[PDB]
Design goal:
The structure is cut from a larger assembly and holds 2 copies of chain A (about 425 residues), 1 copy of chain B (about 100 residues) and 2 copies of chain C.
Chain A: E1 4-7, E2 13-17, E3 23-30, H1 44-50, H2 61-70, E4 74-80, E5 83-91, H3 95-107, H4 113-130, H5 134-146, H6 167-177, E6 183-188, H7 192-202, E7 222-226, E8 231-239, H8 246-258, H9 273-281, E9 286-294, E10 299-308, H10 312-327, H11 333-350, H12 354-368, H13 374-383, H14 386-398, E11 402-407
Chain B: H1 2-14, H2 32-40, H3 43-61, H4 81-100
Chain C: E1 22-25
The chains are: A alpha+beta (about 425), B mainly alpha (about 100), C little secondary structure (about 40).
Protein name (chain E): Ubiquinol-cytochrome c reductase, Rieske iron-sulfur polypeptide 1
Organism (chain E): Sus scrofa (Pig)
Family (chain E): Belongs to the Rieske iron-sulfur protein family.
């Protein structure tokens, strides 16, 4: 069939597509995350992400876990500074039980003191696992330096708050951010009336348009971590655009022109301009990619470089010089067209999977309150002009820079020097 | 109800946990369910229970009873542990039912 | 396209495996790709 | 007797004052510290300070400890970013033994692998104890933000390097930075010829300036800890004049004019301009002071504020406004005279004690070679004009500023806002 | 030069590690509270 998009009177978007697939996936997308947090309640989002299996009014933790395993389904919470998504996946027959569990988790959380106290340890383990890849620490520090407020808040609980997150804070977060107007219920493999019935049964009680955080302000600062790792991971970013704007599409096209993540395994990223520009100057192992992060109120664009400690400055400066090259107008139409093709293929491949389609539909519903078919997004992508890409490069070059680097910072440059 | 309450009060006074300052839940046998219920108690209640038990043990060490004015009254005896113990027993019963089938 | 997953350079894809409770987090293009070819 | 200053051909400076007192204090001042650490060997100075009792070529750890305890003496290492001081204190009769031990420690370290491995744990204990006071971490982050180079290096080992400091690194640091040209042997209660004899005996080797650190470069950055402490500690500083310059004396007079430290216990700090300027605005508990730190290459001047988390911005803005008022020319001659009196009395009281006099003599010998009598320092203080103080305040207000803040930091202003 | 350097000394005998920072306030905080 086709996706059915409905906005209920309370403000809750329910979207259902019947793919007639053996597995049904239903996800509730809530406009709550690290961004919607203040200094006092930092880290609440992380514990909320880890608190899916805790006891709820409808069902006990034992019931939730045991039943979800018994049907073989999976409950997962995927968190983004601006959004938090609860997704339940199971066979088409058993979807209703997992839907009951999911709505109990989201709408009727009973954060009993002992259970919440038990989960406090899991925050440290999860942060340790996530930070094993240095780029997570690099990105968290990058967001901290770029923004004074809102988006600066990390996706992981601050260390000083690891054991001090209180059940009352979780209740306050749920009540003031888990609201109907901030929620979208997207289901693949389920009928629209069933989804409407479930949403009416559970989510109706909470009032919409809850507490709204302050608009992100651009700090434009540098955070440097000396950890002694042989490879220096550094990111130089500037405020680019908010998601859904034409400038955002221009910035995505620029990201692909400079070079997004690699395509050929063990490849040289030959088409990528940044990789070739850095390779011409640096003959040691290196890694350079274009960083584009688009958020509702703001966006960051820049270069992410992994390099040996001695040669980190050379890599950073070479990538910045290539971006300057693009800004000065040395951009070929063929390269722009190739970037557009790569962007369109990337969007299609992202929506290829059930998880990708569910996430995309939920993100569109939350950000824009409507669903755009892939064809329209491709038309938007090809609407971008080369002059717009050059102007986005100019905006990056001229704009104030925020940098985060981790490793043997050593010869790594400072933002002022850049 | 009044007759049952009168007999219950007679039993309460006949038992001496009131004389030692203890409340009824202070005297429960610490089985695993009771241990979990105590673990779940709020800090204030846990500390109050600990001090009441310690005072009762000290009084029994010297074979003494608390002054009659300080005896716990039948009306004012508060079953602090009963809700936590009920929740614990409910969880255990649910687990056993799941194990049965 | 209105999500950090739209940027596929790797949105920090830092999720942890789990069953009946698996928490995942994402940030944005993270690089770390194709440097693994050389130590 | 009077202080005797001799510069030996090897470059070592020997000074002695025979106070004819029951106790003798001998101190070797070396121009080594965190400033001279590179990124690779960060934290070596901390372990070197801790490793003053390890086995040396002349004596074992057992012998050094047991003997110094047996004579009732003390061996102390005091480290600043630009200096390290080894001092031995005992009765005058037993000074020779402790002098031999001190010279053995300074010039003949063994840095045996097992003992160095044993002492690495003490790095974490010392760092934790020092960081119990927030001022320590606040100042370390302030120095890190202000300078991109040597002076940014922390006096306490970085955590990633706690167990990574190697005996070879300690040997390298001692060999290249513990050199005769960089050393001064200052003795109180010891005749000059005896000190010269011992210096010939042990400090003949390792002559020369040694490795030279790079000039410190101002970074003008901000570091915000967000430790959740009830009281926010914030320091706002700008570059200042190096030690032993006229602008440095003007900055000291300015520090005393704005307000440095309480003179009356449990008092309102009436003379302190900053304290009352902040007090009128803020009725909650607060503290404010002027931070003047002068180093050979450069110095930092600014405001240190301890305030409630909610009121941090008000305190910081009020102190900055008072400094701006002084810069604008609203400085009375009487205030300058009072500040000069306070500074001169502070210098005299600091040199009153034996430890203070030894520290002052060593600092002067290392920084400027010769020893200047207290009268000359007081005359330098008197020379400063009111215009000089106003110009120093103007330099602080105009110059680029670096900020380090610790606490809740929800309402703490960023450097740009200030 | 430092009014309130708050040099973070470590109690010791025969081995006393002392590290000195510059004037860092805290002198009058105890007057009000902590």
């Amino acid at each position: 069939q086709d996706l059915e998009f409905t906005r209920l009177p309370n403000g809750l978007v329910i979207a259902s597509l019947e793919n007639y697939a053996p597995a049904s996936r239903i996800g509730l997308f809530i406009k709550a995350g690290s961004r919607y947090e203040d200094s006092n309640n930092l880290g609440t989002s992380h514990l909320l992400r880890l608190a899916s299996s805790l006891t709820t009014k409808g069902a006990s933790s034992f019931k939730i876990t045991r039943g979800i395993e018994a049907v073989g389904g999976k409950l997962s919470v995927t968190s983004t500074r601006e959004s938090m998504a609860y997704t339940v996946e199971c066979l088409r027959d058993d979807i209703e039980i997992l839907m009951e569990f999911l709505l109990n988790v989201t709408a009727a959380p009973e954060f009993r003191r002992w259970e919440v106290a038990a989960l406090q340890s899991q925050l440290r383990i999860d942060k340790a696992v996530a930070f094993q890849n240095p780029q997570a620490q690099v990105l968290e520090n990058l967001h901290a330096a770029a923004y004074r407020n809102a988006l600066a808040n990390s996706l992981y609980c601050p260390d000083y708050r690891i054991g001090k997150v209180t059940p009352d804070q979780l209740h306050y977060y749920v009540q003031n951010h888990f609201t109907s107007a901030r929620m979208a219920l997207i289901g693949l493999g389920v009928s629209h009336p069933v989804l409407k019935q479930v949403a009416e049964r559970f989510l109706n009680m909470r009032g919409g348009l809850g507490l709204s955080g302050a608009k992100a302000k651009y700090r434009g600062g540098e955070i440097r971590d000396q950890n002694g790792d042989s490879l220096v991971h550094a990111a130089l970013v500037a405020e680019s655009a908010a998601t859904g704007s034409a400038e955002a599409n221009a910035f995505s096209v620029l990201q692909h022109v400079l070079g997004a993540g690699p395509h050929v395994k063990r490849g040289s990223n030959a088409t990528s301009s940044l990789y070739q520009a850095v390779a011409k100057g640096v003959h040691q192992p290196f890694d350079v990619s274009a960083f584009n992060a688009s958020y509702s109120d703001s966006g960051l664009f820049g270069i992410y470089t992994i390099s040996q400690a001695a040669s980190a400055g050379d890599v950073i400066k070479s990538a910045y010089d290539q971006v300057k090259t693009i800004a000065q107008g040395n951009l070929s139409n063929t390269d722009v067209q190739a970037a557009k093709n790569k962007l369109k293929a990337g969007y299609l491949m992202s929506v290829e999977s059930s998880e990708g389609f569910l996430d995309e539909v939920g993100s569109q519903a939350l950000v824009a309150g409507s669903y755009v078919q892939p064809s329209t997004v491709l038309q938007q992508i090809d609407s971008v002009a080369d002059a717009d890409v050059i102007n986005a490069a100019k905006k990056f070059v001229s704009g104030r820079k925020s940098m985060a680097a981790s490793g043997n910072l050593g010869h790594t440059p400072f933002v002022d020097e850049l | 109800s009044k007759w049952l309450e009168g007999i219950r009060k007679w039993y309460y006074n006949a038992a001496g946990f009131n004389k030692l300052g203890l409340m009824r839940d202070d005297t429960i046998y610490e089985d695993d369910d009771v241990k979990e219920a105590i673990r779940r108690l709020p800090e204030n209640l846990y500390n109050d229970r600990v001090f009441r038990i310690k005072r009762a043990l000290d009084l029994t060490m010297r074979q003494q009873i608390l002054p009659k004015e300080q005896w716990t009254k039948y009306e004012e005896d508060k079953f602090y542990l009963e809700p936590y113990l009920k929740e614990v027993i409910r969880e255990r019963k649910e687990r056993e039912e799941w194990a049965k089938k | 396209r209105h999500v950090v997953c739209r940027f596929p350079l790797g949105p920090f894809c830092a999720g942890v495996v789990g069953h009946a409770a698996l928490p995942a987090t994402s940030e944005s293009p993270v690089l770390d790709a194709k440097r693994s070819f050389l130590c």
